[PDB]
Amino acid sequence: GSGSQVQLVESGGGLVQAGGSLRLSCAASGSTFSLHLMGWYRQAPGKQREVVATSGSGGDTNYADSVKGRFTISRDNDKNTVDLQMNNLKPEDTADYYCRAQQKIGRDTFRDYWGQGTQVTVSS
Numbered sequence: 291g292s293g294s295q296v297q298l299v300e301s302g303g304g305l306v307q308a309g310g311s312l313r314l315s316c317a318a319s320g321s322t323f324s325l326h327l328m329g330w331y332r333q334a335p336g337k338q339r340e341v342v343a344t345s346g347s348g349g350d351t352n353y354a355d356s357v358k359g360r361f362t363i364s365r366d367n368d369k370n371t372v373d374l375q376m377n378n379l380k381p382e383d384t385a386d387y388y389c390r391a392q393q394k395i396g397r398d399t400f401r402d403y404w405g406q407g408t409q410v411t412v413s414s
Contacts, residue, residue, distance in 0.1 A: 294403060296319065298391055299319070301371070303408025304411070306412055310379050314387055328345050329345060330342040345365045387407055
């Protein structure tokens with residue numbers, strides 16, 4: 291079909307131990323146009339793909355109350371790939387982490403880009 295020029299690639303999805311920390315990165319490539327909103331989502335077994343953290347136009351960050359103080363996200367427009375600092379990995383926090391990039395196009399067009407969710411395995 292018709293697809294956008296930007297692609298998302300999530301880095302991370304490794305194997306960490308209970309209590310450990312991991313950093314995931316979302317690589318946006320395709321267009322030099324300033325990406326408008328970036329966020330991290332999680333797909334957990336038994337749950338729906340939940341919002342973990344979002345960053346708006348001004349880097350307006352919103353995190354789930356359950357990730358406050360443990361998860362931190364950072365966004366550069368194009369010199370860096372968006373960071374997700376995850377600390378205190380719990381055994382049952384093993385899930386897929388997805389990246390969402392939202393771009394405000396032209397005047398009134400909005401697109402949600404989803405990447406390839408990588409699964410983080412926590413060793414207990």
